[PDB]
Design a protein around this ligand. Sequence first.
Ligand SMILES: CCCCCCCCCCCCCCCCCC(=O)OC[C@H](COP(=O)(O)OCCN)OC(=O)CCCCCCCCCCCCCCCCC
Ligand code: HEC
Ligand code: HEM
Ligand code: HEM
Ligand code: HEM
Ligand code: HEM
Ligand code: FES
Lengths: 52, 77, 380, 380, 60, 53, 240, 54, 110
Amino acid sequence: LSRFLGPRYRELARNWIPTAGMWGTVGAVGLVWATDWRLILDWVPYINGKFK
Amino acid sequence: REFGNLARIRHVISYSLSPFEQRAFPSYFSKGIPNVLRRTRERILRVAPPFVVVYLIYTWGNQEFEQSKRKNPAMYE
Amino acid sequence: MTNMRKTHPLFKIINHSFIDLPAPSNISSWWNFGSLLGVCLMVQIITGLFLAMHYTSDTMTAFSSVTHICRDVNYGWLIRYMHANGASMFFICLFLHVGRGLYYGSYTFMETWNIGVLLLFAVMATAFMGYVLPWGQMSFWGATVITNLLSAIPYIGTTLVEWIWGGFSVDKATLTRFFAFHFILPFIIAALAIVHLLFLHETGSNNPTGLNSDADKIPFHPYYTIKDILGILIMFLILMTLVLFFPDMLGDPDNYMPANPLNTPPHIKPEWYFLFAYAILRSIPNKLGGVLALILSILILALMPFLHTSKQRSLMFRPITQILYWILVANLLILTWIGGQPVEHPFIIIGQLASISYFSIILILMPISGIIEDKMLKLY
Amino acid sequence: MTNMRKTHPLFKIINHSFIDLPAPSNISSWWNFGSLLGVCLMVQIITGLFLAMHYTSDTMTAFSSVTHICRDVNYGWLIRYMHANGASMFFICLFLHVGRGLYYGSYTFMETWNIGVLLLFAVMATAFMGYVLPWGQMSFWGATVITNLLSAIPYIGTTLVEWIWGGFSVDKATLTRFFAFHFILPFIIAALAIVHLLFLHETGSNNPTGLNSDADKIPFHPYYTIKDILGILIMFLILMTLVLFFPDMLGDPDNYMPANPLNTPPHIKPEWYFLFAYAILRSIPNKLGGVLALILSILILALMPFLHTSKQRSLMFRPITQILYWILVANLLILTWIGGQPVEHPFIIIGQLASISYFSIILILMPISGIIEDKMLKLY
Amino acid sequence: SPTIPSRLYSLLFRRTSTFALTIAVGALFFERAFDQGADAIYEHINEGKLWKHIKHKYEN
Amino acid sequence: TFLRWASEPEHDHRKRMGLKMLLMMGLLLPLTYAMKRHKWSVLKSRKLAYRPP
Amino acid sequence: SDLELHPPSYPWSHRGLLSSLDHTSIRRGFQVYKQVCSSCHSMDYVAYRHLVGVCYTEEEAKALAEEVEVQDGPNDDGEMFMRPGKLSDYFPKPYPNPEAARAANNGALPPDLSYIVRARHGGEDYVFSLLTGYCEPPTGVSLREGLYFNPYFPGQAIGMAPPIYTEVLEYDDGTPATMSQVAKDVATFLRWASEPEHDHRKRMGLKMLLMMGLLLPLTYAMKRHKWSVLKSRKLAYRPP
Amino acid sequence: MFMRPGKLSDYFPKPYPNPEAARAANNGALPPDLSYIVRARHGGEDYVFSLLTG
Amino acid sequence: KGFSYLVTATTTVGVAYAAKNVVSQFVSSMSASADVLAMSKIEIKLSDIPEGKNMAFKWRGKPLFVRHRTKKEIDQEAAVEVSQLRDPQHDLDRVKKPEWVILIGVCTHL
Ligand SMILES: CCCCCCCCCCCCCCCCCC(=O)OC[C@H](COP(=O)(O)OCCN)OC(=O)CCCCCCCCCCCCCCCCC
Ligand code: HEC
Ligand code: HEM
Ligand code: HEM
Ligand code: HEM
Ligand code: HEM
Ligand code: FES
């Protein structure tokens, strides 16, 4: 879609990428918290204690 | 949404009769056969060549499968 | 006095949807297939309810219960073969429904099209576990094959397969949970069909000419009521001729032996729609690529509204893309035949060419043909 | 730019039904029980779906399958006791729903009340067949009791009980068809609940004062959203303490024995929510009279809106009818108790007087109280 | 004069995305902490009765 | 033949019901088609005129 | 007669709302069942794989599973052979069919003790009262041989001989094997066999009460916060 | 277990109690149950006739 | 606002914890059970089968192939090179013992 090119949409994307990154971060954290992903959860300080 | 405000039609007159006064099959064969033939002639060259090449591919595949299951006479020894 | 049909709220909804619905006056017999699908869904629901009334989902007694249905239950053979041939007729009507949409440009109703695609996945899944439900040889081995296809997914696929199997193979837990899923998903299909009809009613129906048919609108009753009644009667004629004369020409003979986990059939042939998907699977020679090939071969239906690059909605006035469309339908017929045939020469190369041609003429050739046609009619 | 919430069709239906619904601002906690019933229905659907995922409807394997769910399936004991105590909670919420409707004059919504009565029948049948499902001793014997009580009908009863039995007693076919019906009937309950809510939204909601609430109405969200969430949390508290601490006080120990046709239980009783109907049917000493008394005692709720002889809707300003209604609730408690203990002395006369007083209060005494209440308020 | 709820609002409770991040991280840490505390309460209530309390007699 | 019977004990009843279905549906299909053409005859012989000023 | 004697409420170690079972008592009760009760009763819904993890080590459970011989098959030529038991095998039947049990037990059928606590009125209290309640019949109660007077049994004429007494077995812990101790241990074991999810369910309930005592004031606070707009709303009427 | 004369409710008698006895009596080959052999083999009764006469 | 949103966040954390627990219990419920976990690992085996034969059992839901091989087959499969195969792996690394070979019957195609 060539309509979404141009400086206004580029700076709108520049405004919305911190919020998009934050939403991706909370998605990843919720995913690992729900799935109990050992590969990520073994590198925390505390959650090692439950061995999961 | 409903009838009444769908379209804008002006100066159009429609004529209809009773189903109980007109025939259900008015010249069903003497006009049905030329109409079906005309429709077939109009849309026969868009369906028949793909279906015929399907038939050709089907026969070719079955034939060469039978020939591949056939014994090659190169192994006499 | 008050018009109760237009005043009572359930009667108001039935009036606004089925009675006084403005329908195009020129829709062909291809537009009866939605009502055929709904009626066939109701037939499947009722017949399956009777089969589950006389059916036990245990690996020791599933096949014995099916034989008990066919032999001891009064007209249980009629109910079971009605259910099986009605599933086949359901897929026939579903494929003709999708073909009507593809030919007449009904995919521009994007929400309706996407709800239809979700309904399509629900119907294939439901029919798959219904096919494994009698616990035959082909049933068990088809379940094993499709779930190993699920195992082709990297890094989570094995865990998903041990999760969905209820163990480490297709066994008692798999059969029982597949019975529960096959019971419950057609009601989700009915709810999704209600959402389908709601999204259709939001924008009205389509006509073969592809034009704005609001100039000539007729009510759904009595014209399309009696037209759909005639279509229902014709579908019942075909289904009952299948049931009472050829109850096994669409099924599998090898499904009539009990499922032996040791022995295997020399040919693993699922039903013909799964043979189409199966040929698209085996055309690409790796597990992961074949799995994404199958899911993409179904999902390009949902991708279709963004590939429409023509200024005319229907194919009625588009002759080149008509030729490509019938080439595509011919190619699906060839793919079904290859899925039926075993993996021997020349079926590998024929199926590979068929899958390449299928994906190419859906993704590439049809929009290019549309551009050529709009240039040809002096519109580009 | 458009308002997507009230522009998108499914979204605008959801918004007009649940989000922007003008609700009375003063409805108390008694108005949470409809949403509690809906949440209980969803919980039952999920828990029973998993129970049927691990359940086989075979007479030889029903009890062993239930034990396998309880012991071998991970948290299958939790699922099963969630199902049973959710049935108890479902009937608690149903009884409080009906009590709200009777006290606050909600039966004047005649079609909504009748759809609710049909819902009550469907839920009672669903729970009866589900209680039959584990194939315990009390399950089998209660099934025989209820089917013979249906067989009491002259010239129709024997053929109907042989048809429902699938034979000559409660057996393989009866258990399997009861499993099929118990699976399918909650979805009919859900569809009838959509009809219930549709009729209610057509008529609007009722306030405890019984007045015209259009002067002071608030949006459903977020007020009744958070109120219903609090009610759901409290209902889950009671359900989970019933599951995790007292799982058998509302159940029956005799259901933990295998179903023995040769051995009778010491005292046969149905579940606690069938006890008032069981007590009145024991009270009238005729089989046809007893089954007709049961049927009329449940249909009298549908007969209720034609008994409103007062110019006030709710019982908030009706003290005599309040006293009569609380005596009615007390008599329902007596009937549940009398269905508890067997049919001996003095339970004969206690149950007979309880049934006669129950019918007399609900038919004769309440309209007479309303009439003299209007006379005392000088209405005519 | 800035209080602890004031700092919590100015840092984490203002934006919805970082609000949800706070909810998720708190869910993880509170799941571990609540599981540890409730398990310890259960052990202290049922000292000397559980298999994890009596396995050392019958192992090795 | 005995194995065919043991495989399909519903063979004769199925053929009899198929004959009944064939005769019955050969009776209904012209009749239902006649009903469809009768109800649809209003539109099929409808005449359209355009009379602009 | 037609009367029933209600068993009294004994103070078990698991009768509290957060109290678990005594796993040593379940061990002693399993030993009592294996050495005494297994000759007549069946426990077909409980296995050695159920035993491991709450009472025994895996090696100990394997040893006491292999000490009994079970029937298995078929082999290559199709013959029912006999092999030592494994963990996945259930407790062995003392009788192949209930009719054999009735024949070998003077007509009375010994019920399966996998749900007897959950299936009898009183439960473990009823089991303790039945086992320790054997007494001589009173005057006027003539009981034929093969039946024993038991006040806690409905009908008062049980077909069970008194199964336990003083020094009826030997415990491995050195606990005195008195009648009351044996009855309490086997009642604890039968309660475990009826509800294997007992301590796990109690832990779920403890977590649920702590969690809901956290959630309910806070959810109520959210409800009052949202409803504070209406509960403090003031109305005024100013007609002209 | 004991022996009694059969009646109409009984099915056709078992030649072998388990398929391993069939393997033992047929040197490793399993004679399939002939209740669905026509519906199970391609050709059906044609296949049975050709197998017996071939 | 921090106090009110702290109350809201604590409620949401609690509901998230409870929801994750109940969904985890349901998912683990429809996962594998104790019977299929017990019947998978332990395998009873005999040694009453001569050399050059095959035995088909059930191990982890799969057809277990226990093959007693002959010395000619052992020598041929030890002398065959691994450079011409699709995956380089010889018999001394595939199996520990030459007489007995333990394999699965699940084909790596379908
Ligand atoms: C150029 C032809 C001119 C014909 C003139 C006929 C006389 C015209 C004047 C008298 C009127 C007679 C009736 C006219 C009906 C309508 C007009 C008509 O038929 O036109 C010809 C028709 C459409 O023309 P058009 O769309 O331009 O075709 C270009 C092809 N791309 O085009 C056709 O019919 C050609 C169709 C050819 C299709 C070939 C397909 C080959 C490949 C099939 C592969 C299928 C998949 C196989 C598997 C692959 C993988 C292994
Ligand atoms: C063989 C002599 C047995 C021994 C050893 C044990 N029991 Fe038994 N039991 C036996 C019979 C023949 C019967 C039936 C008696 C009758 O009248 O029904 C029983 C019954 C029971 C019961 C059920 C009582 C009831 O009211 O249903 C229980 C709870 C019971 N027995 C307990 C029990 C225990 C705990 C045992 C081990 C110490 C035990 N019995 C041993 C036969 C025999
Ligand atoms: C159980 C499955 C389905 C049911 C019950 C169903 C139902 C219906 C019905 C009753 C109609 C109206 C009849 C008509 O317009 O011809 C309709 C139309 C339509 N369906 Fe479906 N359908 C199903 C599957 C599908 C699928 C698989 C697709 C697409 C991939 C789809 C897309 C459409 C579209 C686009 C229309 C509009 C056609 C038009 O406007 O002319 N549906 N559907
Ligand atoms: C509420 C709806 C349904 C129920 C209760 C149901 C139930 C059943 C049952 C119990 C069986 C096994 C009985 C047997 O095959 O002998 C079965 C088989 C089957 N089901 Fe369904 N079904 C339903 C809907 C559907 C639908 C909508 C489809 C397909 C679109 C479908 C496809 C199949 C197929 C193909 C079989 C195999 C029949 C055979 O092999 O004999 N079912 N169904
Ligand atoms: C599965 C069964 C049922 C469901 C899901 C259901 C659902 C609901 C819901 C969501 C409401 C609105 C919330 C409320 O007012 O509490 C409601 C209200 C109502 N229900 Fe039900 N209900 C069921 C059964 C019944 C029964 C058994 C009756 C009466 C015999 C009934 C009669 C009514 C009436 C009259 C109202 C209107 C109350 C008012 O306007 O204040 N419903 N129902
Ligand atoms: C789609 C919905 C449902 C399904 C699939 C379902 C399925 C089942 C199954 C498989 C059982 C056997 C497990 C057992 O015996 O414990 C059962 C039992 C039972 N069901 Fe349901 N059920 C559903 C809804 C309901 C509803 C709505 C009610 C009552 C209002 C109900 C009441 C019961 C009861 C009381 C039992 C007996 C449980 C016991 O005795 O322990 N069920 N159900
Ligand atoms: S499954 Fe073995 S080669 Fe295909």
